[PDB]
Paper text:
Structural comparisons of all available PTP structures identified four main WPD loop conformations: a closed state, an intermediate state, an open state, and an atypically open state present in STEP, LYP, and GLEPP1. The atypically open state is associated in STEP with a stabilizing 310 helix C-terminal to the WPD loop (Eswaran et al., 2006) and in LYP and GLEPP1 an extra turn of helix α3 following the WPD loop. The presence of an atypically open state, catalytically nonactive conformation, in three PTPs from different subgroups suggests that this conformation may have significance for the family as a whole. Structural comparisons identified an atypically open WPD loop conformation in LYP, GLEPP1, and STEP (Eswaran et al., 2006), suggesting a regulatory role in diverse family members. This conformation represents an inactive conformation in which the WPD aspartate is moved far out of the active site. Low crystallographic temperature factors observed in this loop region suggest that the atypically open conformation is stable, and multiple crystal forms ruled out that the WPD loop assumed this conformation as a result of crystal contacts. In the first category are TCPTP, SHP1, SHP2, BDP1, LYP, PEST, PTPBAS, DEP1, MEG2, and GLEPP1, which have a “PTP1B-like” accessible pocket that harbors a basic residue corresponding to Arg24 of PTP1B. The new structural data and analysis presented here suggest that a secondary substrate-binding pocket, similar to that found in PTP1B, is present also in SHP2, BDP1, LYP, SHP1, TCPTP, MEG2, PTPBAS, DEP1, and GLEPP1. PTPs with particularly high enzymatic activity against generic substrates were RPTPσ and PTP subgroups R5, R3, NT1, NT2, NT3, NT4, and NT5. CD45 and members of subgroups R3 and R5 were extremely promiscuous and dephosphorylated most phosphopeptides with reasonable activity. Surprisingly, sedimentation velocity measurements showed that all single-domain RPTPs studied (IA2, IA2β, GLEPP1, DEP1, and STEP) were entirely monomeric in solution, as were tandem-domain receptor PTPs (RPTPα, CD45, RPTPɛ, and RPTPμ).
Residue numbers in the entry: 914 to 1208
């Protein structure tokens, strides 16, 4: 479950991964399916926490789960469906979480505050094609809204074709924190995304990364399950940095590592292949960069 590939061999690699109706893609993916099967998630299974999980089979591992501050000995007080994930720069660079439910939106804001996260990435619209994905857990207007103990004011909201950016100021009594929220709204349909789809997503990943160099705390990433589009964005973000610095990539290693921190990161084979497609584009662009001589 690591397979590092030299970038000047990546073209031939993906052609081989693609032969026989993507057979080697499937085989790697079947390797990945096994990662984390015997890592405990006892907390995720507590009775009082059943209603805090969007899905019954997307549960946070106990070792990497994010804990909320607990006033109580009440069961599951500290629980949220979120895990820390390593990144390119730090071992707790990200938090991958499900899209908040109405019943957990308060818990979600508590996490943002307690974790001192200044960046939230949302890879879904609240509803898509008449299916619920995520509660609209932030305000609709500029008027501050109380979410349990934490008030959120939208300071600004900028909408583009494929994404929107929102500045939130959050407070808990005398404690105040500023948070940027980035919502990608054009996540492609099943199955082979266009060239423009891949380019749009890479542009989005680039913009979030620019804000991350200015900020501190974990970067919170969610979709609906907090595994599929979420793992994909995290993979892409790390791969962008990696490919800037190196002449090789290990995508298999990368997803294997992520699945050790949260189950089912990169949910589908189609997403796994999409990562490879995005890496082919990153490589093309780096090769364009090679035609400029500075040093
Ligand atoms: Cl950890
Ligand atoms: Cl850390
Ligand atoms: Cl403060
Ligand atoms: Cl890795
Ligand atoms: Cl996809």
């Amino acid at each position: 479950s690591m397979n590092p590939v030299q970038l000047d061999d990546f073209d031939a690699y993906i052609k081989d991964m693609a032969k026989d109706s993507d057979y080697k893609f499937s085989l790697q993916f079947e390797e990945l399916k096994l990662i984390g099967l015997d890592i405990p998630h006892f907390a995720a299974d507590l009775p009082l926490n059943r209603c805090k999980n969007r899905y019954t089979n997307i549960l946070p591992y106990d070792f990497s789960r994010v804990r909320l501050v607990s006033m109580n000995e009440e069961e599951g007080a500290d629980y949220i469906n979120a895990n820390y994930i390593p990144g390119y720069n730090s071992p707790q660079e990200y938090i991958a979480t499900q899209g908040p439910l109405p019943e957990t939106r308060n818990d979600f804001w508590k996490m943002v505050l307690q974790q001192k996260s200044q960046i939230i990435v949302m890879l879904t619209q609240c509803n898509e094609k008449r299916r619920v994905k995520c509660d609209h857990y932030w305000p609709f207007t500029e008027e501050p809204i109380a979410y349990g103990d934490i008030t959120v004011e939208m300071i600004s909201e900028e909408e583009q074709d494929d994404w929107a950016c929102r500045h939130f100021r959050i407070n808990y009594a005398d404690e105040m924190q500023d948070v940027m929220h980035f919502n990608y709204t054009a996540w492609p349909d099943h199955g082979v995304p266009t060239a423009n789809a891949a380019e749009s997503i890479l542009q989005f990943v680039h913009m979030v990364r620019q804000q991350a160099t200015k900020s501190k705390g974990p970067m919170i990433i969610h979709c609906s399950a907090g595994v599929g589009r979420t793992g994909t964005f995290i993979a892409l973000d790390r791969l962008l940095q990696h490919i800037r610095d190196h002449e090789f990539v290990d995508i298999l290693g990368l997803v294997s590592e992520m699945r050790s921190y949260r189950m089912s990161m990169v949910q589908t084979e189609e997403q796994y292949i999409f990562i490879h497609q995005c890496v082919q584009l990153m490589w093309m662009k780096k090769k364009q960069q090679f035609c400029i001589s500075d040093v």
